[PDB]
Every structure is written in structure tokens, then in C-alpha cells.
């Protein structure tokens, strides 16, 4: 679905792992632009690029799997990053297994020389914000679960988007796909400069996008 929607002031994560109390810090990083047009995809399972980064969201508590298939060729030619959640694990297998033309462990039908395979505790009304990026072979995932009342789209708020997990991978992700009444949003990160406001707790309680308007 080509429907667009406004992201408002959502999609800002912690650029680093440094505590800051009452510091208004300017960070130049791949951030989601303020009041940007993010694509709302309804059931559907389209193919979407990656470019520099990807923003993800969820609305209802249906909990329909919601894995991811970050790849670069996805035809058993290069290592592909697959994330599978089964309410007990977050299995991240980077391997060239060949996903079918319409993926939905039967996603793939092969087993190549599968590399690093981190597995840990699961992390996945209830808004579920995610940010996926890759800079120098390190796949970074940030996530935040927030409670809100569903009305029409992403709410107007700014909680924290705390970081989730960094993985040493080394591949390049040029494309990605979503695993599965589907309803989600996709935004694209851009190399912006953001002024982040830290409170006494080291929490980013406010942010300003220094490209949106003259003020």
C-alpha cells in the first residue's frame, strides 16, 4: 500500500552509550527526520530497500511473529541476516539460506556456511518502535515498547527509543523484508543533526531537528 502518514517527533534513539545530565547535546547521526512521510503498509508482505537505515512500528497486540529478513541478494549468493522470534528466542542467523519468492523455519530451503548465530531472550494499543542500522559491519538494533490508545496512526510523543543490541556481522544489507490483519509503518533514516535534551536521569526527554524550519 502506497499510503503515507506523518511520523511526528518519533524515531529518535540514543546515538551513543554516554550518560549526560542536563546537557543539550548536538549529535550528527542517521536520524529519522521530524514530521517525515513514513509509509504505512497493511495483510501484506512487500519488498523494501534498506539504504542507510530502517524504522519500524507496530500498533496492535496481535503479535503475528514479526521477524525480519534483511538480505542483500536473498538467493543463496551472499550471507543474509534473518531474525526469527518464537516468543522464547530472538534467533539471529546470518547465513545464505535461500528464502522462497514469497517468504512467510520453512522460510528458507537450504543451509549454507552459516556464521554468527546470536540467540537470547525475546524482545518482541502497544506501540513497538524499532530502528535498524549498519555502519561498519555492526548491525545495530534499537527498540522501545510504549503504551498508547490507538486512534489513527503513530501518536504524538517522544519516549526514549533505548538501544537494544549490537551484532558484529560484517556483511552489507542493501535490502530487507518483514516476516509474518497486518499493520506497520516504515521510515528511512537520514544523516541529520539533532539537538537532544537530557534530564537529570540521562534520558532524552526532548529533541529538536535542526533542518525542519528556521526556528
Amino acid at each position: 500500500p502506497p499510503a503515507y502518514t506523518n511520523s511526528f517527533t518519533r524515531g529518535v534513539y540514543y546515538p551513543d552509550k554516554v550518560f549526560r545530565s542536563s546537557v543539550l547535546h548536538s549529535t550528527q547521526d542517521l536520524f529519522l527526520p521530524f514530521f517525515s512521510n513514513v509509509t504505512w503498509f497493511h495483510f501484506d508482505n512487500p519488498v523494501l530497500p534498506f539504504n542507510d537505515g530502517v524504522y519500524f512500528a507496530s500498533t496492535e497486540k496481535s503479535n503475528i511473529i514479526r521477524g525480519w529478513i534483511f538480505g542483500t541478494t536473498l538467493d543463496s549468493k551472499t550471507q543474509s541476516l534473518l531474525i526469527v522470534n518464537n516468543a522464547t528466542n530472538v534467533v539471529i542467523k546470518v547465513c545464505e539460506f535461500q528464502f522462497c519468492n514469497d517468504p512467510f523455519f520453512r522460510v528458507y530451503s537450504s543451509a549454507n556456511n552459516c556464521t554468527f548465530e546470536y540467540v537470547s531472550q525475546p524482545f518482541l494499543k502497544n506501540l513497538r518502535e524499532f530502528v535498524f542500522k549498519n555502519i561498519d559491519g555492526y548491525f545495530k538494533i534499537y527498540s522501545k515498547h510504549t503504551p498508547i490508545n490507538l486512534v489513527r496512526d503513530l501518536p504524538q510523543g517522544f519516549s526514549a527509543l533505548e538501544p537494544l543490541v549490537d551484532l558484529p556481522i560484517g556483511i552489507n544489507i542493501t535490502r530487507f523484508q518483514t516476516l509474518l490483519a497486518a499493520a506497520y509503518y516504515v521510515g528511512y533514516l537520514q544523516p541529520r543533526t539533532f539537538l537532544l535534551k537530557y534530564n537529570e536521569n540521562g534520558t532524552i526527554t526532548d529533541a529538536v531537528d535542526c533542518a525542519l524550519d528556521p526556528l
Partner: protein, 414 residues
């Protein structure tokens, strides 16, 4: 003498001269080498009862973990340990990306064929190590447990490709017969069988050889030796290496509240004002332990040769040259002053120390430190219907010196 040399002169006037600086040296360094973390399972590839053969190895592709080469190096359980161009100890410091281990059993004497450099006949058919091989090869005549299936390559014509997996067993001699005819007269199985019984000699006994070739450096780096983790030595100027953050200071206890994903504590400007130790997950406040400035108070050279020493912003206990902590030690807001006696009488300021404290040369003669007096204490007698009229005068000739011009100087730049 320090004042004389810092001024490049043999005579010094009266005043305070800043000679050198003061800094408390670090007592020790704290790294306290790291956790168990995720260990590399080398014991599985070494202590393998079902050891494979040279034609087909137990291909163990090992990934992010800490491989303790020191464990395999300080123990002489295996007969021979080799590692390419690297001492085993430093093997725990310089690290790499990923490792691949191939384990096999060979026939005794021909342990030297498998080598990155010098060639061997066995390496020409069974397995040739890469020319740019960098790994660790462990060989030992295990015998007993693995001695009582074991067939070794004997029929090939080209050296095995660097880091290749070949398990071919088709029957042929070399190329001469146009039709091999299964086993005609000499085309036996390439995997020749041998006797692996205890009666065999050292050169014909099962020799367990395991190669541990690690891939060269790429964009990531996961298989690394022991690094990270810290400890606590609080209230002491020490060098600390906290997860790669290296610096000198005092790690006092802190009441800060880090979120459970932040480690550093850079607050305002870019200085690290706090840190988190990855052993107890507590917050330590980094502070500059002590520094200041050594200033010499001297009443000139013509008048005398005695001096006093002021340390700018240090305590009188933190001062350890000659005598610097015994007697005549007075702690003022402007620092710790030694060599000067505190007098309760207040005089006009002579040598300004700071914070209302001055120093002077007075009585034999010594150096006194006092609180400067603002002036004569006049009593003001205000009274209405009362006036004061002068009945005499004085003609006072005062002086006023004013600079007007400086020396005109030209410089030939070329």
C-alpha cells in the same frame, strides 16, 4: 635557585614567582584482566574420541569467543604446539576475526609435511596448508585411546588447494590406462589402509594433528583474547583502564544513576566525569586527584635569601623536595603555605598570596603570613547641629608617574 633559574637571572625581586607545577603521581594501574565470557570450545576439537582422518576432517568453524592459547601453551599435554609467526602468550593480545579447525590422524613420521612453507609428499596429496597460513597446529602421538577406518590419501597428482576440502576416493593409478577397469592391476583405493595398533612404532602410530587456521582481519573482529573488565581501588590517584577508557584520576564512590545501557559518564564539555565498572555495575566518579602550582614567596635577594612555598589548590597533607610537610605549615583558602608563620596581627599587604591573605618579611627576621588590613580604623562621629571646621592647612606636593611611549621596534621579517 628554582626562582633564579626560571627567571634566567641571578637576582630576584620581592614577590611571588610561579616555579614549576605540582601533580600527585598515580600510585598504581588497574585493569584486572577479564571475565570467562564466551569461551572458545577448543576442548571439543582436541579431546575428540571419534577423531577423523586426513581425507575428511571434523570441520569446526568457530566464531565469536575468547580462545585461551595460554591454557594450551602452559600445559605440555600435547607433544608439539606450533603457531605461525606468533608467540603463544602474545596470542592472547593480538586477535583476529574467526577461526576454523580441522582435526585428523596421520602416520607418525610424516608430521612435517603439513606446513605453510616447506613442502612434503603427504601435503602434496592429503592436505596442503595455505601459503599465507596463520593459525595454530597441534600434533601429538596420542595412541592408546584412539589406537586399536583410518585410511590415508595415496593417489593424487596435484597439491591440495590452500584451505580446500577434498574427499575424493575414485580408483585410478595416475592417467596411463585409457580404461581403469575398476581395480585392474594397480588402481587400488586412494585411501590406503594402515595398521594403527600399539605394536606399530612411533613413525607408524596414529598422530593426532589439528590445524587452527584463523581468518585474517576484516571489517569485524570477534574472536579475541582476554580484554575488558576492571576493579575498584577507591579514593586514590590511580591509572585506570575501564573497557578501553584509559585515564588517571581518583575513583570515588558516586551517587549517579546511569541507565542500564550507558557506561561512560561524559557530562558537560567532553570530559569523562563518571564511569561504570563491568564487574559490579556500579558508578564511579572520576576526579582529578590533585594538581596546582608551586609559587616561591621571596623578599628579594638584596634583603635576604629565605623563601616560602605556596601550593595553589592542594591540601597540606597531600604535599610530600627538601622539607614540605614539617612545621610552619598553614592551610589557607589560597592553598598550603610552608615556610611562613601565621601572625594574628594584620598589617598592610606586602606580597599578595590571595583570598585576603598576604605575606611579608618581619621579625630574628622571618616570613609571616597574615590577613591584610583594609586600612586605619577610624571612628566616625556623626552628630546633627555639630560641624567640624579646619583651622589650618597644608600644601602637599604629591607625585604621579605616567608612561607615555614605548620603545619603537622594527623587525626585518625576511
Amino acid at each position: 635557585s628554582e626562582t633564579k633559574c626560571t627567571l634566567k637571572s641571578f637576582t630576584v625581586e620581592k614577590g611571588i614567582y610561579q616555579t614549576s607545577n605540582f601533580r600527585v603521581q598515580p600510585t598504581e594501574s588497574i585493569v584486572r584482566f577479564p571475565n570467562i565470557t564466551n569461551l572458545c570450545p577448543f576442548g571439543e576439537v582436541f579431546n575428540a574420541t571419534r577423531f577423523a582422518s586426513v581425507y575428511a576432517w571434523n570441520r569446526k568453524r568457530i566464531s565469536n569467543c575468547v580462545a585461551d592459547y595460554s591454557v594450551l601453551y602452559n600445559s605440555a599435554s600435547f607433544s608439539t604446539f606450533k603457531c605461525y609467526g606468533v608467540s603463544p602468550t602474545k596470542l592472547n593480545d593480538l586477535c583476529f576475526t574467526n577461526v576454523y579447525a580441522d582435526s585428523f590422524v596421520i602416520r607418525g613420521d610424516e608430521v612435517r609435511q603439513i606446513a605453510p612453507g616447506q613442502t612434503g609428499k603427504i601435503a602434496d596429496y592429503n592436505y596442503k596448508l595455505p601459503d599465507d597460513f596463520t593459525g595454530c597446529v597441534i600434533a601429538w602421538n596420542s595412541n592408546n585411546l584412539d589406537s586399536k577406518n583410518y585410511l590415508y590419501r595415496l593417489f593424487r597428482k596435484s597439491n591440495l588447494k590452500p584451505f580446500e576440502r577434498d574427499i575424493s576416493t575414485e580408483i585410478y593409478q595416475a592417467g596411463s590406462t585409457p580404461c581403469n577397469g575398476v581395480e585392474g592391476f594397480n588402481c587400488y583405493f586412494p585411501l590406503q589402509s594402515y595398521g594403527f595398533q600399539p605394536t606399530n612404532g612411533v613413525g607408524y602410530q596414529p598422530y593426532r594433528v589439528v590445524v587452527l587456521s584463523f581468518e585474517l582481519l576484516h571489517a569485524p573482529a570477534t574472536v579475541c583474547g582476554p580484554k575488558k573488565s576492571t576493579n575498584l581501588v577507591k579514593n586514590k590517584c590511580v591509572n585506570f583502564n575501564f573497557n578501553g577508557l584509559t585515564g588517571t584520576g581518583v575513583l570515588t564512590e558516586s551517587n549517579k544513576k546511569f541507565l542500564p545501557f550507558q557506561q561512560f559518564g561524559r557530562d558537560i564539555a567532553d570530559t569523562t566525569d563518571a564511569v561504570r565498572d563491568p564487574q559490579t555495575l556500579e558508578i564511579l566518579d572520576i576526579t582529578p586527584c590533585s594538581f596546582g602550582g608551586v609559587s616561591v614567596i621571596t623578599p628579594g635577594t638584596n634583603t635576604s635569601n629565605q623563601v616560602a612555598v605556596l601550593y595553589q589548590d592542594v591540601n597540606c597533607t597531600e604535599v610530600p623536595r627538601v622539607y614540605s610537610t614539617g612545621s610552619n605549615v598553614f592551610q589557607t583558602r589560597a592553598g598550603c603555605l610552608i615556610g611562613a608563620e601565621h601572625v594574628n596581627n594584620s598589617y598592610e599587604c606586602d606580597i599578595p598570596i590571595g583570598a585576603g591573605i598576604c605575606a611579608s618579611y618581619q621579625t630574628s627576621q622571618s616570613i609571616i603570613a597574615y590577613t591584610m588590613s583594609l586600612g586605619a580604623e577610624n571612628s566616625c562621629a556623626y552628630s546633627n547641629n555639630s560641624i567640624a571646621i579646619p583651622t589650618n592647612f597644608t600644601i602637599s606636593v604629591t607625585t604621579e608617574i605616567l608612561p607615555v611611549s614605548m620603545t619603537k621596534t622594527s623587525v626585518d621579517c625576511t
